Design a protein around this ligand. Structure first.
Ligand SMILES: Nc1ncnc2c1ncn2[C@@H]1O[C@H](COP(=O)(O)NP(=O)(O)OP(=O)(O)O)[C@@H](O)[C@H]1O
Ligand SMILES: [Mn+2]
Ligand SMILES: [Mn+2]
Ligand SMILES: [Mn+2]
Ligand code: NA
Length: 308
DNA sequence: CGGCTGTACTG
DNA sequence: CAGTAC
DNA sequence: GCCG
C-alpha cells in the first residue's frame, strides 16, 4: 500500500468532487483506488502508464510528487472548498446548493441555521450534522436490523429482513443501515410497508423521515436508552421475484455495482435492482445472486469480495 | 469525441 | 425538470 | 481524470 502520492491526489480529488466536477473526480477516485493496490510503490513514469486507471495526465502528476515532492495544482484549489465541503456534508445538500449558499455569503453552519433557506431534508440533515458524520459499530447495525425485523415479523413472521450495504460486506463500521425486506411467498410483501413505518414511528424508533416512496424509505432512527446517536436507516421492500437482483444491488458496493452494470451493458444486457435483462428486452431468470454472476460470465464473489 | 450505472423522490 | 440520493 |  505504498501511497505518499495518493494523499496529495485525494486533496485534489475531493476539491473536484465538492465543486461538482464529478467525472474528473471519478477518474481520480479510480486512479487512487489503484495506487493503494499496486504491490511495490511506483518507480518509473512508465511504471505508471502501465497501470489500469493511470494515464498521461495522472502519470506526469505522480512524477511531480516523487521528483518535486509536491504537486503545484494543490496551490490553486479554491479557498471556498473547505466551506463547500462543510455545507455539502449536510444531508440533502449537494454541490449546487453548497455553491449557492457560498455565493450568498454564507461561510459556517451558524450562517446556514440563521439565514439559509433549507429544504425539509436539509433541516433534518443539519439537526443531525455531527451524528451523520459518525459511522456506527457493526454491533449497532445488528441491533437496528433486528429492531426492523422484529417489528416487521410482527405483521408476518415469514418476512425476510436482511441488512445489506457495508454491513453485509462485513465492515466493522457502517455509515447507515440498509434493510431489504421481502417475503419468499412472492406476495406477502405487499400492504406492509406503510404499517411497518407507522409502528417503528409509534415505538419512537423512527425520529425523522427524509424520503418516502412506494417501496423505498430513507430516514432516521435512534435505539432506546442513554448514549445513543441518531443513525440513518434506509429500507426497501421488494417482491420475492426480484430478491436476488435487489440483494445484489443493495449490497454493492456502489463501485462494484457500477462495474458489474457496465459489464452487463457490453454483453447486450442491462442490470438493475429489479432484474438482469437483455437490452431493449427479456428478463433473464436470476433466482440467486450466483445466477447473476454466471449469466455475466463471472465467478461468484462473496459480499466481502465486493467491497470496492 | 464522448461515456463514464441505473433508478427514484422532492418541489 | 434540476438536484440529491441509494 | 480514465478509456475505447
Ligand atoms: N450510486 C450507486 N449505484 C448503484 N448502487 C448504489 C449506489 N449507491 C449506493 N448503492 C447501493 O446501495 C447500498 C447502500 O448505499 P449506501 O449509501 O448506504 N453505501 P454503503 O456501501 O452501505 O456504505 P455506508 O452506509 O457504511 O457508508 C450500497 O451498498 C450499494 O449496494
Ligand atoms: Mn449503507
Ligand atoms: Mn443507505
Ligand atoms: Mn443525535
Ligand atoms: Na449532502
Amino acid at each position: 500500500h505504498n501511497l505518499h502520492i495518493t494523499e496529495k491526489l485525494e486533496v485534489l480529488a475531493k476539491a473536484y468532487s465538492v465543486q461538482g466536477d464529478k467525472w474528473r473526480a471519478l477518474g481520480y477516485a479510480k486512479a487512487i483506488n489503484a495506487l493503494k493496490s499496486f504491490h511495490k510503490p511506483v518507480t518509473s513514469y512508465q511504471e505508471a502508464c502501465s497501470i489500469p486507471g493511470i494515464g498521461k495526465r495522472m502519470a506526469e502528476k505522480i512524477i511531480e510528487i516523487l521528483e518535486s515532492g509536491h504537486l503545484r495544482k494543490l496551490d490553486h484549489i479554491s479557498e471556498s472548498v473547505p466551506v463547500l465541503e462543510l455545507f455539502s456534508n449536510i444531508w440533502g445538500a449537494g454541490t449546487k446548493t453548497a455553491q449557492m449558499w457560498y455565493q450568498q455569503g454564507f461561510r459556517s453552519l451558524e450562517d446556514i441555521r440563521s439565514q439559509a433557506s433549507l429544504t425539509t431534508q436539509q433541516a433534518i440533515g443539519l439537526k443531525h450534522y455531527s451524528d451523520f458524520l459518525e459511522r456506527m459499530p457493526r454491533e449497532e447495525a445488528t441491533e437496528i436490523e433486528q429492531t426492523v425485523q422484529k417489528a416487521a415479523q410482527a405483521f408476518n413472521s415469514g418476512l425476510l429482513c436482511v441488512a445489506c450495504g457495508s454491513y453485509r460486506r462485513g465492515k466493522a463500521t457502517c455509515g447507515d443501515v440498509d434493510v431489504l425486506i421481502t417475503h419468499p411467498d412472492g406476495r406477502s410483501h405487499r400492504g406492509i410497508f406503510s404499517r411497518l413505518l407507522d409502528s417503528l414511528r409509534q415505538e419512537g424508533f423512527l425520529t425523522d423521515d427524509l424520503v418516502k416512496g412506494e417501496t423505498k424509505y430513507l430516514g432516521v432512527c435512534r435505539l432506546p436508552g442513554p448514549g445513543r446517536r441518531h443513525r440513518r436507516l434506509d429500507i426497501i421492500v421488494v417482491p420475492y421475484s426480484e430478491f436476488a437482483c435487489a440483494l445484489l444491488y443493495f449490497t454493492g458496493s456502489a463501485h462494484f455495482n457500477r462495474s458489474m452494470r457496465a459489464l452487463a451493458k457490453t454483453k447486450g444486457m442491462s442490470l438493475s435492482e429489479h432484474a438482469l435483462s437483455t437490452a431493449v428486452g427479456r428478463v433473464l431468470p436470476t433466482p440467486t445472486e450466483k445466477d447473476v454472476f454466471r449469466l455475466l460470465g463471472l465467478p461468484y464473489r462473496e459480499p466481502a469480495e465486493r467491497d470496492w
